[PDB]
Each structure stands twice: as structure tokens, then as C-alpha cells.
Design a protein around this ligand. Sequence first.
Ligand SMILES: Nc1ncnc2c1ncn2[C@@H]1O[C@H](CSCC[C@H](N)C(=O)O)[C@@H](O)[C@H]1O
Lengths: 396, 390
Amino acid sequence: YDWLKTVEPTNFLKIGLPYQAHPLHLQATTPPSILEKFKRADILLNEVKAEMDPLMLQPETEKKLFQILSSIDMFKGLRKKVEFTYNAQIVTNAWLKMYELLNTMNFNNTSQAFCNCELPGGFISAINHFNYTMMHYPTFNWVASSLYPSSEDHYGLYQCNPDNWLMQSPLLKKNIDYNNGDVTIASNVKNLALRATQRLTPIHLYTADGGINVDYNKQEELNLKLHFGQALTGLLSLSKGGNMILKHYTLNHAFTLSLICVFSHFFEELYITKPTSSRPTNSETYIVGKNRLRLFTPKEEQVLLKRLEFFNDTPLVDLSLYQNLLESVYFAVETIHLKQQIEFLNFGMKCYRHFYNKIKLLNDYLAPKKKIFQDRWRVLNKLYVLEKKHKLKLCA
Amino acid sequence: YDWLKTVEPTNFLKIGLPYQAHPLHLQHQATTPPSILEKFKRADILLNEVKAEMDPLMLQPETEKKLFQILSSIDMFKGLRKKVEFTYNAQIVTNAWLKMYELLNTMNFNNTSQAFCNCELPGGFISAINHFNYTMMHYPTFNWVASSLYPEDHYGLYQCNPDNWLMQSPLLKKYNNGDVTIASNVKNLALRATQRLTPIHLYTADGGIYNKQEELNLKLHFGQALTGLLSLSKGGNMILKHYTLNHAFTLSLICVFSHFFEELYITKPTSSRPTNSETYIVGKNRLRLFTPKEEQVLLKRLEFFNDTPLVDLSLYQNLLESVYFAVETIHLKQQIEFLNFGMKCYRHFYNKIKLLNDYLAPKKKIFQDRWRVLNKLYVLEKKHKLKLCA
Ligand SMILES: Nc1ncnc2c1ncn2[C@@H]1O[C@H](CSCC[C@H](N)C(=O)O)[C@@H](O)[C@H]1O
């Protein structure tokens, strides 16, 4: 009915965080009152997220819920087009997300990528595709890692490029320095960053796209350690003047807020971002630091690695020293999560309610709206055919 | 905090349903549901979405406690029970008392004097009716029979009136334990009611065992319904407690009701908590009794119970529309707004409970003074008190 066509196209949400003049002290203390706003956001957003619980109780309705949520992905058809028409590889939704990030973030240099938690490899491939067709980089050097458990590389990007991947297979289990890619493990983060700086100087682009897979309303808290080792891997490897793209989620926990406060001292610009192709129904955010200003001191490295090693929830910094910054993160929360995500979660519920058994009919009603959003994406993020000689080597 | 200072009393919600002239045909065969059942499915999905919004607070008992404090803070009638109890010598002033009393004061029953109150313990419904009959109706004597799944009898109303109660203690397993999900007990209860009390002008049923609350209760509410319908005399009235009214069985049962009463309502008394889905189906002026077959078909329906509609729902479009409007008014609009309101109170006051109570106390008194003005109360004389053993 009406609601289905009035859908507004979404914007690349990009919220700058103000630069923090004072030096960094990793020390928590009496939290600033703004933390209360964030907890209200988290309660509210979990409330709206909790609305899909009844649907989760039976695998029948769960399946139909995710069909509906896939039906309101406004960009899925764009992936097939971009592959077929422009020779893009590994055109997952992450490819779209990375390519959109690279166009609108205007990075100074993306010619040397370390992509962490990358397993399929959309980010690498988008970076590759961007660097050749848009940045006209003579060559592209990259390294990647992903969690290789001793228990996936859907496109063969890992196995067809063993030199470019920094974790080790389960055949190297029992090695004293076995690095399975798990960035929740402090020694793996040291080793990964050491290994990257070795195959790659300088590293201009760090990306980290990891997420625990589980319950939906503890998602940020369940990922704090992963996302903290993601960040640490990047801050140990990224060169000065380098750039960082980290996948996050809701940003309401003090720890997350404190880690952003940490990020605030290392980059000249720092954005919380939500590409349009980042599914507005989820809480996923990408934290983007442009122009790394300086590297860790040996003390900062020690402390943060010790935190990752013996992890806990507590703020990394005194959060009341960053009132300005939390106000802008809160704006980002309000824009990305309390406004956009809640509306698109509500819209998704309304789609489930009215179409849970009429999936075909829902995709028929949205198809023109989908094309409008993919058209506008194609206008904003110019695409160019990638030359065979600059494809990635794929084994699948 | 304007959204606290413009809070206004709720209104008695009352949605008339159309009586069906067409002859009742109890269904033998499953049938293709009418498309309006989909809109009831959507109301159920939505109402469960908003209910689900409290799940995250449910997981950790620390925030669970705060949530129930918050829902207590927003219960606008919280102190009314005790005010009613002292001021007017009212008995068993549970919330069921207020609800039945409000029901009696709004629905303008032709007669409330020969009561069968089923699934009734501790006895607020009987008490409200006793209170209303003696202070408001002035019947010479009020005769009533009651039943309830054998105890809990928190006021000794059952212990002290063995003549009036139609279920039996476990020492009589020989037997009717007052479980209205058992067809034989339902028929038996009705017989017992019609023998101990002739005639029966008022039947009430207050039984209830969250996504499936309605569905978990279908059998119970069917038995409730059958017990009344098998014993409610002609011209008599019925008050049935329900919940969400979205399952096709429920709707089909309302359909059955529509053949037997001159008027038929879905109601949400203000003293029924606006945050829960509780409804009261009210039939006024029973026009006819079951035929023998209708009794056999319906009781057999309860004996080997399933979901399937009692009637062809597609022959009740009009009624079904009026029910939807009831669901729209009570559940999708009122109840969802009040749950939302509770969640908004939780977020802003989960740590400021005393403050929220301060904000709402003046409103709580205006709401309660309003209920007292709308449902006038008079002191109940001692010689008309029910006899209580506790
Ligand atoms: N603790 C951990 N350390 C490192 N990688 C992890 C991890 N837990 C999960 N991962 C990996 O992180 C990845 C996140 S999904 C990566 C998506 C990628 N941008 C794309 O091409 O689509 C998964 O492959 C998962 O196996």
C-alpha cells in the first residue's frame, strides 16, 4: 500500500568527530552524564530490536523474517550488475560498502591495504577495483588476515594468494607462534601487525570488518574484544598518514566510546559512517580515521595490548575529557541508530507483517524503489570496467 | 516531561458487536478463512512486537525488577483498591472487584441478581456483584453460585459458603474439580448451577492461565464460554474475560456468542490494566438457549479440542469488522500506547522511580477520583457482607 512507495532514499551517513587537542592518558572515574543518553539509546534500540523476538521463536517465521529483511536490501541487485558490467570480483555487499566508503571518504592514499577479518574478501577487491579504475595506481600491494579456526574463503582469494594472507592454517597449530587470525588474542595482534609491516611499508589503508556471530541486543558488548583487537591490529600496523576503516555496531558502551576517544588522538579526521549499502536495518557502523597523525608510544602499545590480553569492559580513558566528542558520537548514534535504523527496523516489521507470506509480491512492489536507490548509488560512486590484467587471483 | 503532565484518564472502552440473525451453523469441517483474518494476524504480530520490546529488560533480574517497579509506577489505579475497601466496607477488593464493579456500572444490565461466577476465586467478581446488588440494585436477597479450579481461596469465600460453590475438594475424587477445560465438568458445572439457582441472570467467568497467551487460553476460555452458555437463562447476561481476540478460534467463539444475545460488546474497563491485553466480552439479554445439538456439538468440540473455528468465519464479515475495531481500539491503539508509555517511563526513570511516582501521584488521584465518580460507590451494610473464613 502507500507506505511502500513513500520510502525515501538514504544518505551515506558521515558524522565527523572533533579533533582532540589534549594528550592521551590511558588510565575508571565518575562517568560523564552524557553516558546516560547513550544508555537510553541502547535501551531504546534494544527495545526496537527486541520486536523481532516473537518471530525468532520458530524456524519457520525466523526464515521468513530474514527473507523480508533481504527483500528490503535496496542494493542486492546492484552487486550482480557491478560484477557483470564492470568486471568486479567478490561483489558481496561488503564490496559495495567498501567501494562507497572509498568514493565518499576521499582518502589521501589507498595503495597499500591491510584488510583484517576479511575472509571472503569484498573489501580487498573493492579496494583493488577502486585503486586501478579510479586511483590509477600503477600497482596495488595488500595483505589480509581473517580468523582461520582449527575446526570462509568463498572465492579462493586466500588460497590463491598465500603470500598476501597473514594468518596460518590449522596445519601450523601447535607451532609456538601459531597465529590463526583471532584478533581477540594479544599475541596474534602483535604478530599480525608485525607481519603486515614486514610485507608492506608503508601501510596506507587499514580495514577491519569483523563481527562475532550470535542473541541480537548484546551485539556491541559481545564484539568489544574483537573490535578492540581489530583496532589494535590497525593501530600497530597503519603508517603515519595512513587511513583506517573499522566495522563497529551500536557505539553505546563506555568501552566503545573510550576507544573512539583513543582513535581521536591518532587521526587528523575521524568519522562514524553508515554507507547506504550498509544495511540500514542493522547497527553496523564504519569508523574512519583519515591521515594518521602519529604512532603509538611504547607505553601506549604496552597498555592497550595488556588490555586486549586481560580484557575487561572499563573505559580506556576518562570520558569526561571528551564531552565534545561524545556529543558528536551521540549525534551519530541518533542519526544512524535511533533515527535511521529504528525507522528501517519499523519499516522492516511492517513489511514482515503485510508480506511475510507474500515475499514475491514485496519484491515486486520494491523493485522500482530498489532501482532508484541503485541508480543514485551509481551516480554517487562512479564505476569503471576493471582490466583483466588487474583482477585478483581467485581460486573459486 | 510534558508527556507526563498531559496524561489523561482512560475511558471505558466499549465496542458493540452485531447480533447475527442468520441461523447458527456449528462447523463440522475446517474451512477457508476470510481475508479479514489476515488483518487479525497482523494485529497479533504487531501487538507481540510491542510486547516484545520489554524482553531485553527481562533477561537480567536487576533490570527486571526496575521494569516491574516502572509498570507499578504507571498503574494509575494503584491505591484505589484499598480506598474502595475501607471507604465502603467492600470485600475481596482485588482488581477483579473494580473491574466487575466498573462493568456493572457501565453495561446497564437488565438484572444482576442470580449470579453464576465461574473461574472465580478469590471472589472479587461475586463480591463486586454482591456489593453492587445490595448498595445499587436493592434486590431483596442476592443468590449466587460460584466455581473455580479447586484452590486459590485467599479470603475464605469458598470455605465459608459450601452451599454456593459447585466444584469439589480433592477428598471427593470418586467428581468436578471445577476445571472448565473438561467437557464433562463443564456440563456438570452448568447442571449444578441450574439446579442450585433458578433462574440465572448473570454469568461471569474470570479465568486465565505472552505471544501465545490467547492461544494457551483458548480451551479455558472455551470452557468458560460453554459453562455460561449452558446455564445462562434466557434474558440473562454474560461477562467473559478474554485477551487479544486475534486467534480464529476466539473470533469464531465470539461469532457463536452473537447468536444468543440481543447486544454484544468487547470491553476494556479502565480498571482493567491498559498495558495488558485483557478484554471482557459482555452479552446482554440472552435471546435463546442452545438446541440439544448445539450443546452436543459444542461440548464435543471442547472434549476433543482443536484450533479449528467453531463456525464459518466468512459468514460474519460484519461482526469480524466490529471485533477488529475492538482489537484496534483496545490493543493496537490503547494497549500499545500504554506499553510504549511504560517503556518511555522505563528509559527516563529506571533509576528515578521515586521521581516518576511524584510526577504521577497527582494524576493518580485524579484518575482514581474519576473512577469513583463514574462508578458511584455506597457503603455496604454489614448484614449484606459475604461470609468470609479468612
Ligand atoms: N576473533 C576474530 N578475529 C579475526 N577474524 C575474525 C574473528 N571472528 C570472526 N572473524 C572473521 O571476521 C570476518 C567478518 S566478515 C568479513 C567481510 C568481508 N569484508 C567481505 O569480504 O565480505 C569473518 O570471515 C570471520 O571469520
